[PDB]
Design a binder for these strands. Structure first.
Ligand SMILES: Nc1ncnc2c1ncn2[C@@H]1O[C@H](CSCC[C@H](N)C(=O)O)[C@@H](O)[C@H]1O
Ligand SMILES: [K+]
Ligand SMILES: [K+]
Ligand SMILES: [K+]
Ligand SMILES: [K+]
Ligand SMILES: [K+]
Ligand SMILES: [K+]
Ligand SMILES: [K+]
Ligand SMILES: [K+]
Ligand SMILES: [K+]
Ligand SMILES: [Mg+2]
Ligand SMILES: [Mg+2]
Ligand SMILES: [Mg+2]
Ligand SMILES: [Mg+2]
Ligand SMILES: [Mg+2]
Ligand SMILES: [Mg+2]
Ligand SMILES: [Mg+2]
Ligand SMILES: [Mg+2]
Ligand SMILES: [Mg+2]
Ligand SMILES: [Mg+2]
Ligand SMILES: [Mg+2]
Ligand SMILES: [Mg+2]
Ligand SMILES: [Mg+2]
Ligand SMILES: [Mg+2]
Ligand SMILES: [Mg+2]
Ligand SMILES: [Mg+2]
Ligand SMILES: [Mg+2]
Ligand SMILES: [Mg+2]
Ligand SMILES: [Mg+2]
Ligand SMILES: [Mg+2]
Ligand SMILES: [Mg+2]
Ligand SMILES: [Mg+2]
Ligand SMILES: [Mg+2]
Ligand SMILES: [Mg+2]
Ligand SMILES: [Mg+2]
Ligand SMILES: [Mg+2]
Ligand SMILES: [Mg+2]
Ligand SMILES: [Mg+2]
Ligand SMILES: [Mg+2]
Ligand SMILES: [Mg+2]
Ligand SMILES: [Mg+2]
Ligand SMILES: [Mg+2]
Ligand SMILES: [Mg+2]
Ligand SMILES: [Mg+2]
Ligand SMILES: [Mg+2]
Ligand SMILES: [Mg+2]
Ligand SMILES: [Mg+2]
Lengths: 71, 326
RNA sequence: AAACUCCAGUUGACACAAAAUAGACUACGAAAGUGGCUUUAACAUAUCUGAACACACAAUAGCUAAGACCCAAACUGGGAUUAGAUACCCCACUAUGCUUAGCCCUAAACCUCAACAGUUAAAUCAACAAAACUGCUCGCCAGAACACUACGAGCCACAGCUUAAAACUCAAAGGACCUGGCGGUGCUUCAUAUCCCUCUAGAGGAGCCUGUUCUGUAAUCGAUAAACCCCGAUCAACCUCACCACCUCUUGCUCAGCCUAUAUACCGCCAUCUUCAGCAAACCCUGAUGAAGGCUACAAAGUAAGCGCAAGUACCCACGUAAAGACGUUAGGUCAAGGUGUAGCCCAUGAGGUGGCAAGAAAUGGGCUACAUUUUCUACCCCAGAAAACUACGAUAGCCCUUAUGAAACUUAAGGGUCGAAGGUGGAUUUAGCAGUAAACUGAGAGUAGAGUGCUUAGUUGAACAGGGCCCUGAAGCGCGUACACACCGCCCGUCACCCUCCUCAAGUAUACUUCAAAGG
């Protein structure tokens, strides 16, 4: 058979890889900011829980971990 | 002002020294010829040009050095006869500096017709009326048929759109005579959509007019620079001393090939840009080069320094091919 | 070329690399994978189905760390080719391929066939692939493109993977097959005066003749690559004549006229392939009654007729040469042979008279005559004598004078005189010819009052070569591929600071909007 459908996908993937290459430093700064907000959004969800349960502070000895950092 | 292209290399390359006689087949403005009469005060030099205006400059500049520079006028083909009248048939010329292309003065003066940007008569002829019957670019475009004119553009201009740019010229000439540079430039642009006027780019990646390949094409067919270049090199060889350093300067591929294929013996009828794969395929069919007469001082073509290119963009494409006769 | 020259050859010693032959076998394993030898362990389930995410795996490439390193090798350096750079080629060498310990989790990971069970009778079946189906279950799909993308989420992944949209946009996108076209497509055999070489005489150089082009002119038209160019013309001093200038006529030689436009409305007569052998009907049969196809002679679905070829006829045979040569191709040629559709003129685009143009700065086609000794002149029609280089060969040209035709002749033709030029056998290229031909020479005819170096045609003398090939040219047969069909001068893809539509991200910054009391003392 022909390979015209494969060729369309080939070009799409090539241009995508080429776009990612050109903007890989901007995309890295954007990804970092998203992970920071993701961590903040997670921290708020846990604070909402203990606050809606009647507690005024986090459970004694509880520290919310950083679950989105590369480390 | 136009600094002589690669003057530092050409001076070192020829190493002009006392007791050596040199020739210059393209005096033009004389910047190179003067740079050579500065390093060695005891040098002997001969000049030549196709432009009588260039030959007058040499005559006026001969006052600076009475006999160290000898001015001559004529084409490369006519150079041997002109120099043969002097009687230096063996010549024993230590070096022949065959600078190529159009002179800075020739294309800086709009009257000469070489500049598309300015408005001058469509002469585009290095000859300065020394032969008043020599056809000018205006004559070439108004006479030749589409097939004939297209070949001029295709072979000499390296122009893909030879049929498209030639048809526009044929139609335009019928409406009115093509006699001015801007008139032609507009006709060539009219073969393409209006935006095409500056779509094309140079190797410098700066926009160029869409007719910069028709001004070069006609320039080389009016002045027969390519055929005259083959005889010019041959004549230099006959008049060049054994052990004498030749130095050429090729600003475009067509002239560069001839200098390459002459200093290396390669047949002029071979295919261009032959790859190693094609070379194997060519010789495999036959299965079923002569001794070189030169020693290339620098094996690979030199080129202008990138910093110097910006200062003198006209000379960006200057490819210097040096050789010693064998 | 560079590189190497503690290089190369023989011999011996010598691996953490890779595993000829067997293997023409088609086995093992869930898949990925697994083909040197040995040993140990060892290849789940006594109903089936059952996951993007649970569980465990998963080629190649890749990451992290530590080792090995023969060979290979992205990358890189050098050499070469190249107008030049990269690549293709050569040399050297690295990541990597290996081992170990962790990751990463992708493939055209494809028998492109989900697992299990059953059937071969029905209809065999859109097509192709891989004979057609039934039961049952899970997974998945619902126009193209956007999109292996965006956002969200998860992940040892950080230029990553998995899952996976919408807006704007379009009337298609797509699958299979057939035909055609095309292929820098395969093989095969070819052209017979031919594609090339080979044979003979030429053209291309000179002058002249003649056509065309260009230019010129107040002054036609048509033909105009093959298939125009001594072509319509077997023919222009007036006439012819359709052209130009001037003058004249108006029911006009005609129950008017128009050589006005349109050959891209036509008839008529033709060019061209054709130096072809095919074309168009009436039937029949195959393919499930799809587009399509239809031959095997020890014959298997084709056939009774028409046109062309063929036959026959003309010329001197049955040979040859003529003639013939369909359909179709080039909207080929001709409205100016005549006729004619349509449109236009009618005091003028019609009709008549007078005079006039029909040239050459040139370029080019065809022809003629030459450049001579196989010749030149004379006699003769083949046993001769002279000529034979600046008084030779060579004008059919120029000039001058006669004659012929005509009312009209510097002009047309013939003859004489004078003149004695270029030319010294012609580059690329190119034409014709297979035998009574080419070549050479001689006569006649058509048409005119006269007029061609043109045309048609009769005769005379009379050769050489005919083999060998397939780059180019074109042809045929049997194939292969095809995203082209406006048919490769095709089509599509990427690219670009022109444009509008839509979407996403995003710094900080405010802006409203939602939530609390669905509580406690
Ligand atoms: N065939 C030829 N014979 C002689 N001179 C030629 C020529 N083709 C070109 N030329 C001349 O050579 C020169 C080349 S360009 C000028 C270069 C000169 N050395 C200078 O002083 O700048 C021009 O003057 C040009 O007119
Ligand atoms: K083995
Ligand atoms: K094997
Ligand atoms: K497969
Ligand atoms: K085909
Ligand atoms: K000739
Ligand atoms: K016709
Ligand atoms: K007619
Ligand atoms: K008509
Ligand atoms: K001729
Ligand atoms: Mg795309
Ligand atoms: Mg070496
Ligand atoms: Mg199961
Ligand atoms: Mg599921
Ligand atoms: Mg599964
Ligand atoms: Mg998966
Ligand atoms: Mg893996
Ligand atoms: Mg690895
Ligand atoms: Mg190696
Ligand atoms: Mg290594
Ligand atoms: Mg191993
Ligand atoms: Mg596989
Ligand atoms: Mg299953
Ligand atoms: Mg079927
Ligand atoms: Mg869809
Ligand atoms: Mg992918
Ligand atoms: Mg993704
Ligand atoms: Mg994301
Ligand atoms: Mg001639
Ligand atoms: Mg004419
Ligand atoms: Mg015409
Ligand atoms: Mg016509
Ligand atoms: Mg034609
Ligand atoms: Mg008259
Ligand atoms: Mg007349
Ligand atoms: Mg008339
Ligand atoms: Mg016609
Ligand atoms: Mg008979
Ligand atoms: Mg016969
Ligand atoms: Mg005939
Ligand atoms: Mg017949
Ligand atoms: Mg026509
Ligand atoms: Mg008529
Ligand atoms: Mg009239
Ligand atoms: Mg004489
Ligand atoms: Mg005479
Ligand atoms: Mg008379």
């Amino acid at each position: 058979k022909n390979v015209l459908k494969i060729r369309r996908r080939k070009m799409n993937h090539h241009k995508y890889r080429k776009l990612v290459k050109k903007t890989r430093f901007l995309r890295r700064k954007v990804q970092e900011g998203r992970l920071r907000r993701k961590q903040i959004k997670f921290e708020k969800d846990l604070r909402r829980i203990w606050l809606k349960a009647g507690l005024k502070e986090a459970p004694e000895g509880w520290q919310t971990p950083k679950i989105y950092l590369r480390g | 002002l136009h600094i002589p292209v690669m003057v530092d290399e050409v001076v070192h390359c020829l190493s002009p020294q006392k007791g050596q006689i040199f020739l210059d087949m393209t005096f033009g403005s004389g910047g190179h010829t003067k740079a050579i009469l500065q390093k060695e005060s005891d040098i002997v030099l001969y000049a030549l040009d196709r432009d009588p205006t260039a030959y007058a400059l040499a005559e006026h500049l001969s006052e600076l050095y009475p006999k160290q520079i000898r001015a001559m006028l004529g084409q490369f083909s006519q150079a041997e006869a002109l120099l043969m009248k002097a009687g230096v048939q063996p010549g024993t010329f230590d070096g022949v500096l065959m600078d190529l292309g159009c002179s800075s003065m020739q294309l800086d003066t709009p009257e000469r017709g070489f500049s598309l940007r300015k408005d001058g008569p469509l002469d585009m002829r290095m000859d300065g009326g020394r032969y008043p019957d020599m056809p000018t670019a205006a004559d070439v475009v108004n006479a030749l048929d589409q097939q004939a004119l297209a070949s001029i553009l295709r072979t000499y201009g390296e122009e893909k759109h030879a049929k498209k740019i030639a048809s526009a010229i044929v139609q335009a000439r019928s409406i009115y005579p093509i006699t001015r540079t801007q008139q032609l430039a507009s006709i060539v642009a009219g073969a393409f959509p209006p935006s095409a006027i500056y779509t094309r780019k140079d190797l410098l990646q700066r926009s160029t007019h869409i007719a910069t390949k028709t001004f070069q094409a006609l320039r080389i067919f009016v002045n027969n620079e390519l055929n005259e270049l083959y005889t010019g090199l041959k004549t230099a060889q006959k008049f060049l001393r054994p052990g004498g350093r030749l130095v050429a300067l090729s600003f475009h591929s067509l002239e560069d090939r001839i200098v390459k294929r002459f200093l290396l013996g390669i047949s002029m009828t071979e295919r261009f840009n032959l790859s190693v794969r094609q070379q194997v395929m060519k010789t495999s069919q036959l299965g079923s080069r002569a001794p070189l007469m030169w020693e290339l001082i620098h094996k690979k073509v030199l080129s202008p320094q990138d910093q110097d290119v910006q200062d003198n963009p006209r000379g960006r494409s200057a490819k210097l091919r040096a050789a010693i006769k064998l």
